[PDB]
């Protein structure tokens, strides 16, 4: 402790200088001779009603037609986004939930919350009912995110400064990712499913390694808590949203910040972030009751999605870019286009 | 109709699900939810028991055919600025303070101020439970307390002669009780804007009428909600 704090600071200064030496041009200037998208206007194609309390999470299905939503009255609902039918309505054991996830195959769903337990439900069962198939426990804090890898592998992110790679068949952690010094709020899987990034309340994001369990990289550009994170479709960049009232883009290869999307009027905090299929549109929910759309290459806002009367919680673009669904705290889902 | 023989059955299934959701909505509306806070020495476990690695605990109790669910966190870290946003649609926040220990009174005052001034808890109304009254009375009447050591402004405080209800108690303890309640109420009324009210109380360990004060304050909260709905207050 005597000289360790000095060596750590010297190494941090070395890292900062190395990052400075590899920044000759800014993305603001290289992407200056690009035609702007003008104005992207979207309209509510569908309005899904039926939740009693605020909506805390949503996840699109892999077929771009089904979706799942989690509410604070203790209900998951699996909709049919084309005809607004209710395919499934699953009651929960603990009514304090902040996350939900759809399996890539479509057989399973997952939900977690304030009871420090991640529950895996089996949809495609005989007897025609949805029953809980696994209750993964072992976290010492509330569960803030969960994302499937296969039908037998799921990555969870909790509020005890940890992430975990589980094994649903046997039901115990196979890997634990540690290194954060605050609540971890969101994670985003890589397209190839070999890495993932995680943002925490200590104003930092970290790029991990699923198979080894190490912490490959650390990004520190924000100045407050981080609420949402998302991968670029290429898999070599990711966007982060904070209570800073700013959004940021980070590069895995250049290992530094690329662009910050902000506006002097906005003083609220970002709650959700998603990308478009081509990566030319960054969508970001907000605390002032309405979403936003940013040109991800030139940092000028080019669209607003104002249809909610309360805080916007969740937001996610579908796989083929058909629609965009945004949930919020007044219990209504809205599929735009 | 332009619907197949199977999409009609899908629609019928959706309608059955909607009917079940309506029943669940009735059941969800009929009940009131409370959030219980407090430190380790506050004795909130005694209040929990007086109502006849898991991250939350829930207890159920009913009075006058009204159902209450009380939640308290049990295994979360001490940061509280991210899992407190979930409790913004609750009826009330029960707050428990140990008033006999003046070493930690400022910490409790800071906790109450931070809860009161919260951005998402800006409509919920607190129900203050000043606990351990017998301990405070004994420690004051036995001397060697010197409340002025921690609060310098207690050397020039006089009891509010207008409102002095006490069923045969020593006049020295009354000054201390009303000083503590005055501190908490001053924090309450410094910035309230008239949207939520603090309801202070005085409780012991063997007190039995703790399930009725909750009911009375909840009824008053509901009445104020109705008055605000009809634009009378």
């Amino acid at each position: 402790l005597d000289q360790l704090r000095q060596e750590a600071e010297q190494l941090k200064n070395q890292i900062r200088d190395a990052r400075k030496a590899c920044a000759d041009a800014t993305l603001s200037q290289i992407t200056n001779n690009i035609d702007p998208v003008g104005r992207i206007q979207m309209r509510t194609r569908r309005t899904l009603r039926g939740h009693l309390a605020k909506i805390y999470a949503m996840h699109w299905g892999t077929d771009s037609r089904l979706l799942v939503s989690a509410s604070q009255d203790g209900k998951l609902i699996i909709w049919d986004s084309y005809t607004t039918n209710k395919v499934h309505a699953i009651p929960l054991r603990s009514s304090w939930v902040m996350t939900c996830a759809y399996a890539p195959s479509g057989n399973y769903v997952a939900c977690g919350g304030l009871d420090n337990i991640c529950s895996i439900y089996n949809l495609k069962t005989r007897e025609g009912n949805v029953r809980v198939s696994r209750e993964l426990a072992g976290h010492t804090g509330y569960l803030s995110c969960c994302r499937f890898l296969d039908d037998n592998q799921i990555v969870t992110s909790s509020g005890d400064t940890t992430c975990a790679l589980w094994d649903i068949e046997t039901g115990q952690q196979t890997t634990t990712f540690t290194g954060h010094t605050g609540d971890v709020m969101s994670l985003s899987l890589a397209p190839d499913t070999r890495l993932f990034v995680s943002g925490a309340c200590d104003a930092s994001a970290k790029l991990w390694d699923v198979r080894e369990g190490m912490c490959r990289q650390t990004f520190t550009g924000h100045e407050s808590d981080i609420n949402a994170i998302c991968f670029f479709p290429n898999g070599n960049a990711f966007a982060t949203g904070s209570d800073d009232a700013t959004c940021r883009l980070f590069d895995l290869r250049a290992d530094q910040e690329l662009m910050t999307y902000s506006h002097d009027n906005i003083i609220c905090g970002i709650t959700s972030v998603s990308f478009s299929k081509s990566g030319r549109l960054l969508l970001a929910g907000y605390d002032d009751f309405n979403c936003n759309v940013w040109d991800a290459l030139k940092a000028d806002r080019a669209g607003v999605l104002a249809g909610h009367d309360n805080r916007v919680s969740c937001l996610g673009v579908t796989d083929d870019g058909m629609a965009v669904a945004t949930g919020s705290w007044d219990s209504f889902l809205k599929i735009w286009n | 109709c332009t619907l197949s023989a199977e999409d009609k059955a899908a629609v019928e299934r959706s309608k059955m699900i909607e009917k079940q959701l309506q029943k669940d909505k009735q059941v969800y509306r009929r009940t009131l939810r409370l959030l219980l806070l407090g430190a380790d020495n506050s004795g909130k476990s005694t209040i929990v028991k007086q109502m006849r690695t898991s991250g939350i605990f829930e207890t159920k109790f009913q009075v006058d055919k009204v159902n209450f669910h009380m939640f308290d966190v049990g295994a979360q870290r001490d940061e509280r600025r991210k899992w407190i946003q979930c409790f913004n649609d609750v009826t009330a926040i029960i707050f428990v303070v140990d008033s006999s220990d003046y070493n930690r009174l400022q910490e409790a005052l800071n906790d109450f101020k931070s809860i009161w001034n919260n951005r998402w808890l800006r409509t919920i109304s607190v129900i203050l439970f000043l606990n351990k009254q017998d301990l405070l009375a004994e420690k004051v009447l036995a001397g060697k307390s010197k409340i002025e050591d921690y609060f310098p402004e207690f050397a020039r405080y006089t009891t509010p002669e207008d409102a002095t209800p006490e069923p045969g108690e020593d006049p020295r303890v009354t000054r201390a009780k009303y000083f503590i309640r005055k501190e908490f109420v001053d924090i309450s009324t410094a910035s309230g804007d008239g949207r939520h009210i603090c309801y202070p109380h005085f409780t012991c360990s063997v007190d039995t009428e703790n399930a009725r004060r909750i009911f009375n304050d909840c009824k008053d909260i509901i009445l104020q909600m109705n008055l605000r709905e009809y634009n009378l207050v």
């Epitope: 605050g182 200590d202 808590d225 209570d243 | 001490d78 509280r80 931070s114 001034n117 951005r119």
Partner: nanobody, 127 residues
Framework: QVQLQESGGGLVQPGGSLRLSCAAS????????MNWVRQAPGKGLEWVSD????????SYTGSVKGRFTISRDNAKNTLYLQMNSLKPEDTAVYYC?????????????????????RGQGTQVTVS
């Protein structure tokens, strides 16, 4: 990255006067409600002083209500605490603990065990 350093303390006998500084960098100084906390040997973290964004609102912890005074300078990005007439109950480690989110009045858990936006600490002893 946010970082706070309070290299302003020293060693003085009772009845003397000290002054604690705080250099802040990595964030906009003008939107945050900075604090001043302290930890005594054998005891946990406790709150000492307060100050608002522009300096209009101030608050103290009673035991220092008549002695200490907290000020700030947003042009030089600094936070000062003038402390005089030190009592033997003031030997402790002082922290420049910040405030989680900007543009807010409430802000939680400033005196937690493991807080993120908080300085290293300065030890002051009176004897």
């Amino acid at each position: 990255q946010v970082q706070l350093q309070e290299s302003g303390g020293g060693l003085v006998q009772p009845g003397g006067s000290l002054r604690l500084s705080c250099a802040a960098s990595g964030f906009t100084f003008s939107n945050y409600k900075m604090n001043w906390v302290r930890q005594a040997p054998g005891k946990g973290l406790e709150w000492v002083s307060d100050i608002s964004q522009s300096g209009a609102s101030i608050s103290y912890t009673g035991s220092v209500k008549g002695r200490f005074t907290i000020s700030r300078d947003n042009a030089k990005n600094t936070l000062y605490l003038q402390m005089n007439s030190l009592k033997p109950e003031d030997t402790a480690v002082y922290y420049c603990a910040r405030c989680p989110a900007p543009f807010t009045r409430d802000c939680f858990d400033v005196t937690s065990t493991t807080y993120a936006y908080r300085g290293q600490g300065t030890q002051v002893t009176v004897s």
